[PDB]
PDB file of C-alpha atoms in Angstrom:
ATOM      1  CA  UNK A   1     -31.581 -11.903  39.012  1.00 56.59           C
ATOM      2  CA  UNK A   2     -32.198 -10.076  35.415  1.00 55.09           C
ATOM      3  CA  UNK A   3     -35.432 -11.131  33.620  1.00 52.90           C
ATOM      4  CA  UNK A   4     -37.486 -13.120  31.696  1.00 50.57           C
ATOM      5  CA  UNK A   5     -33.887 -13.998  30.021  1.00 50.95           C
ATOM      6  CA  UNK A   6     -33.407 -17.190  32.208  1.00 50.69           C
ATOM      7  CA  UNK A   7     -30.665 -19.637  31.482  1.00 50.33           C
ATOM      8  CA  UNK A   8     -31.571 -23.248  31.318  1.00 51.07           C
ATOM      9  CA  UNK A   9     -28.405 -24.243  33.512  1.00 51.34           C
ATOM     10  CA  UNK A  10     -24.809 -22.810  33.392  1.00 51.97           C
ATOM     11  CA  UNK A  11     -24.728 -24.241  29.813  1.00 52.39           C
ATOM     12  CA  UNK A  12     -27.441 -21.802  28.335  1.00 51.30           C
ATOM     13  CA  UNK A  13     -24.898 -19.324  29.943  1.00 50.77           C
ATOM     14  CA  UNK A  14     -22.097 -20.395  28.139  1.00 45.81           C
ATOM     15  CA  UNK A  15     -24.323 -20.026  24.831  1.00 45.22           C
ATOM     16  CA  UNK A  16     -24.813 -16.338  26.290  1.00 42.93           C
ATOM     17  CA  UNK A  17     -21.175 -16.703  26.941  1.00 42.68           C
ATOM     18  CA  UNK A  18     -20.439 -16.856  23.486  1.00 41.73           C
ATOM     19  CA  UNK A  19     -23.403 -14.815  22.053  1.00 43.45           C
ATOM     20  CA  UNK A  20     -22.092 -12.092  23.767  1.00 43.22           C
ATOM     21  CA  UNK A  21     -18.410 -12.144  23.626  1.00 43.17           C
ATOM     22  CA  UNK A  22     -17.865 -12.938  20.247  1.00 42.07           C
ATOM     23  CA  UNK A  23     -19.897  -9.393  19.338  1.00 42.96           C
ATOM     24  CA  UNK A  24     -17.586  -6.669  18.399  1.00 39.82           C
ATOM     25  CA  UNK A  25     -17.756  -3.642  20.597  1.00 37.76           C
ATOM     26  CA  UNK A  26     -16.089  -0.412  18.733  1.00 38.27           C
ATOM     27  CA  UNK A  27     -13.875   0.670  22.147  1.00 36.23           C
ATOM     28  CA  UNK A  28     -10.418  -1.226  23.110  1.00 37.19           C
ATOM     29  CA  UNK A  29     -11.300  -1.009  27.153  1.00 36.79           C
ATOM     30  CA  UNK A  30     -14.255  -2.768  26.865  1.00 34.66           C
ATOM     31  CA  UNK A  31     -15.819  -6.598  27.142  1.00 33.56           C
ATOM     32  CA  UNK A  32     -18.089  -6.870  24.142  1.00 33.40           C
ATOM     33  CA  UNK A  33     -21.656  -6.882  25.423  1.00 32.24           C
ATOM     34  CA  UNK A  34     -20.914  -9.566  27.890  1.00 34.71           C
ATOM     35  CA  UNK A  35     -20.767  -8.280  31.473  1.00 31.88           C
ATOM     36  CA  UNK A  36     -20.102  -4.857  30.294  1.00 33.05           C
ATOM     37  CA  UNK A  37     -23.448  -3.718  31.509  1.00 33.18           C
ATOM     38  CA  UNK A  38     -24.628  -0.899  28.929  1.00 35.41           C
ATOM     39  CA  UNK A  39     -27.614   0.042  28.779  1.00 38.83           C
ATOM     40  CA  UNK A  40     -28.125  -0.635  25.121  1.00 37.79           C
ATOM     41  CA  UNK A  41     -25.686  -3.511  25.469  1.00 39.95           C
ATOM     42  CA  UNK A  42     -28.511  -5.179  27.455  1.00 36.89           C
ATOM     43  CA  UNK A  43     -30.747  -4.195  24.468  1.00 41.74           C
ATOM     44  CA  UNK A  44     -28.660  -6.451  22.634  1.00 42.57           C
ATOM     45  CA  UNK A  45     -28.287  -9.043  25.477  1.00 43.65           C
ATOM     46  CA  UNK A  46     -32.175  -9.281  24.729  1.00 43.86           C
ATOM     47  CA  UNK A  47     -32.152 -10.450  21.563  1.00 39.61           C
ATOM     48  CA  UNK A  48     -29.666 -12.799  21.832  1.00 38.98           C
ATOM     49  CA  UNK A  49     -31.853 -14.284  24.641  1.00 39.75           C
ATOM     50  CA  UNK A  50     -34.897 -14.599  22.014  1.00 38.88           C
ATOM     51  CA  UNK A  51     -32.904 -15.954  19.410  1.00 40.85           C
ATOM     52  CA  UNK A  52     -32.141 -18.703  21.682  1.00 41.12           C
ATOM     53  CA  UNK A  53     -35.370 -20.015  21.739  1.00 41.02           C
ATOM     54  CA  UNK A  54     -36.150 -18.990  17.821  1.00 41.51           C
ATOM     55  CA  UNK A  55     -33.726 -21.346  17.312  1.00 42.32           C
ATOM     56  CA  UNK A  56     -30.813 -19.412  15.945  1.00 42.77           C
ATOM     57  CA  UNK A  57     -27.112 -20.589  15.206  1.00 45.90           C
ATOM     58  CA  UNK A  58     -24.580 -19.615  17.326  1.00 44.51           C
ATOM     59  CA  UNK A  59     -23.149 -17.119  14.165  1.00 42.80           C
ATOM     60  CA  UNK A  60     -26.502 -17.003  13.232  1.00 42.15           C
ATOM     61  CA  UNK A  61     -27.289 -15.176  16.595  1.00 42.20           C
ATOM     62  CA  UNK A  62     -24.776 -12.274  15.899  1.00 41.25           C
ATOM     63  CA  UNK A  63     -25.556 -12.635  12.278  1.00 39.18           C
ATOM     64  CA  UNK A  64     -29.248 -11.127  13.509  1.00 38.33           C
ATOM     65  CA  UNK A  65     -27.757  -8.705  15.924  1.00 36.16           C
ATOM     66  CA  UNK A  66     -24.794  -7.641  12.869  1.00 36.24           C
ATOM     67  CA  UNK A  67     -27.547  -7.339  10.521  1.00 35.78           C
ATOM     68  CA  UNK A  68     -30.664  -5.812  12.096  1.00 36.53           C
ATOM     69  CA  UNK A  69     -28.239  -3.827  15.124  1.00 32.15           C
ATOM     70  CA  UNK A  70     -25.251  -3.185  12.555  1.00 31.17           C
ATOM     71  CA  UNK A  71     -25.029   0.447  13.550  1.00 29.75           C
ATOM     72  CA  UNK A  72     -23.189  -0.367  17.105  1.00 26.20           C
ATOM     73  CA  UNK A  73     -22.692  -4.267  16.857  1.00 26.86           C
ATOM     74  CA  UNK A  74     -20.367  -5.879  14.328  1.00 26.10           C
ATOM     75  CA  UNK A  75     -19.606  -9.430  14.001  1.00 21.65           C
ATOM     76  CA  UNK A  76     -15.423  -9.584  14.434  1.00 23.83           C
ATOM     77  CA  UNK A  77     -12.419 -10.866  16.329  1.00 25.69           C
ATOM     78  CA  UNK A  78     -12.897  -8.587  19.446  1.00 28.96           C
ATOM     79  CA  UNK A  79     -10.296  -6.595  21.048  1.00 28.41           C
ATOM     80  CA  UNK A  80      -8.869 -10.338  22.313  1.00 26.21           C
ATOM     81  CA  UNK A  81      -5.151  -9.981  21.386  1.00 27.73           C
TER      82      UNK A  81
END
């Protein structure tokens, strides 16, 4: 059990799925900011969660974390071969 960032059913969690595992994460050994746990890869986990219910896009959702969270997050083909 995490937080106030609930998913509606294991569908909202393949939204969070996505939302997290199509966000670039600058190292080859790890899983985007999916289950990889970080500390400030929760951060971002956060936002993705409230920009489910602003009523973001799917790109639109990593657009916000690319754009306001550029510094660490990048919105690429991750290190999936």
């Amino acid at each position: 059990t995490i937080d106030v960032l609930q998913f509606k059913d294991e569908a909202q969690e393949q939204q969070f799925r996505q939302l997290t595992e199509e966000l670039r994460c600058p190292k080859c050994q790890n899983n985007s900011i999916a289950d990889s746990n970080s500390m400030i890869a929760t951060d971002l986990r956060q936002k993705v969660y409230e920009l489910m219910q602003e009523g973001k896009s799917k790109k639109e959702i990593v657009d916000y974390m690319v754009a306001r969270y550029g510094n660490f997050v990048t919105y690429d083909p991750p290190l999936t071969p």
